[PDB]
Structures are given as C-alpha cells and as structure tokens.
Amino acid sequence: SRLNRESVIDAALELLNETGIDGLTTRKLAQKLGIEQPTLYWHVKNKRALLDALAVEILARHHDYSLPAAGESWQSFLRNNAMSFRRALLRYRDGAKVALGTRPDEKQYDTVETQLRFMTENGFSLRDGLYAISAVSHFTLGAVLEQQEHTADENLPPLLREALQIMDSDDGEQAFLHGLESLIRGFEVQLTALLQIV
C-alpha cells in the first residue's frame, strides 16, 4: 500500500493495538502494509526508530491540550494537560510503554519551550517548574501503565478484599483524578513558601 511517513505510522498504530508493544515487529508491519521486508527497510530501519516516531504521532493526533489558554492559571494548565496526556496514552494498547524514555522531538520544540516558559512566568525557577512537569508526567505514566498492563482468592484479609473491590469498580480515572489534585496542591505549597521553612 502507500509508504509515505503518514501511512507507515497509520499501519504501525493499528498493529500496536492488535498485538501490543512486545509483539510489534518490522516483520509483522511489512505483512500488514502488503510489502517485503527489504521494501520496509528503506522507510523504517529498526523497532527503536518506529517506537520514537509512534511516541510523537500519538500526541500529535490525540493530545489536544498541549498549550495554556490566555489567562489560564498554571494549576489549571497542569490539570488540563495531564487529563489530555492520559487520554492520548490510553488511546492505543501499551501507549504509555511507547512514550517511556523518549525526549522532546524537534517537532515538539516550540510547544515544550512554551510550556517551560509559561511555568517560569508564573514564579517557578526553571529547575522547580521542570520538577513539577516531570512529577505530573511520571505520575500519569505510572497510572496508565498499571491500568493498561493489568488488562494484560478465598482467604483475602478483609481490608485488601475491599481495596481490590474499590480498584475493580472503576477503570482507574477516580484514583488518577484524586492523586493529581494532591500533586498540584503540593507544588502550590512549595511555590508559595519561597525561602520560608515549610
């Protein structure tokens, strides 16, 4: 079929959904695109190369809250950013595993530069703003992995039994949204304190 970048990414995202990350292969991608393995090699060198591009394109297609509104608070921006990051990552099977260990792409520079600039213009040192960004990113990544990977007893002590009932009664959105408010409020306590002991 068509082998421009857009079409190779479309097929690679379908395959990721049917098979997951550990069963995504250049052999199986060649099969789905209707082509021979050496035809594929011209366009895509290895699994790593593909994985890097998939991390970028999932957010381009599905991460709609990358940038703060005019007048929006930093707290609100982190809330709306995190929910949109979580949605984009749940959209494909092992989506969060695809995003793991990547660094901003050249095509994300203007966007992530605007994000860091926004945090500094709201009173964070670059280092403290980055610590807040990284903590929201890591918490969200952790929550999506545990949910997604989870999809992949008679003598339960009583509080564990009820806790497992609580977890199994929801997809994880409730625990996620509660955790995010705790994180955002902790950053606020830290920022407002300045040089006071807190």
Residues near a copy of itself (CB under 8 A) are 22, 100-101, 103-104, 106, 109-110, 112-113, 116-117, 120, 126-128, 130-132, 134-135, 137-143, 145-146, 148-153, 155-160, 162-164, 166-167, 175, 178-179, 181-187, 189-190
Burial class (CB in 10 A: 0-12, 13-18, 19+), 113: exposed
Residue number with CB closer to ligand DXT (7 or 114): 114
Residue number with CB closer to ligand DXT (108 or 148): 108
Q: Determine contact, residues 39/30, Cβ cutoff 8 Å.
A: yes
Q: How is the chain split among helix, strand and coil, in percent rounded to 5?
A: 70, 0, 30
Minimum separation from the CB atom of position 33 to Cl ion (A) = 7
Q: Is 107 in the site for Cl ion (CB under 5 A)?
A: no
Residue number with CB closer to ligand DXT (35 or 141): 141
For the chain, how long is the longest CA-to-CA vector?
Answer: 65
Residue number with CB closer to a copy of itself (27 or 178): 178
Q: Determine contact, residues 88/59, Cβ cutoff 8 Å.
A: yes
Q: Determine contact, residues 1/7, Cβ cutoff 8 Å.
A: yes
Q: Tell me how many residues contact Cl ion (CB under 5 A).
A: 10
List of residues contacting Cl ion (CB under 5 A)? 1-6, 25-26, 34, 47
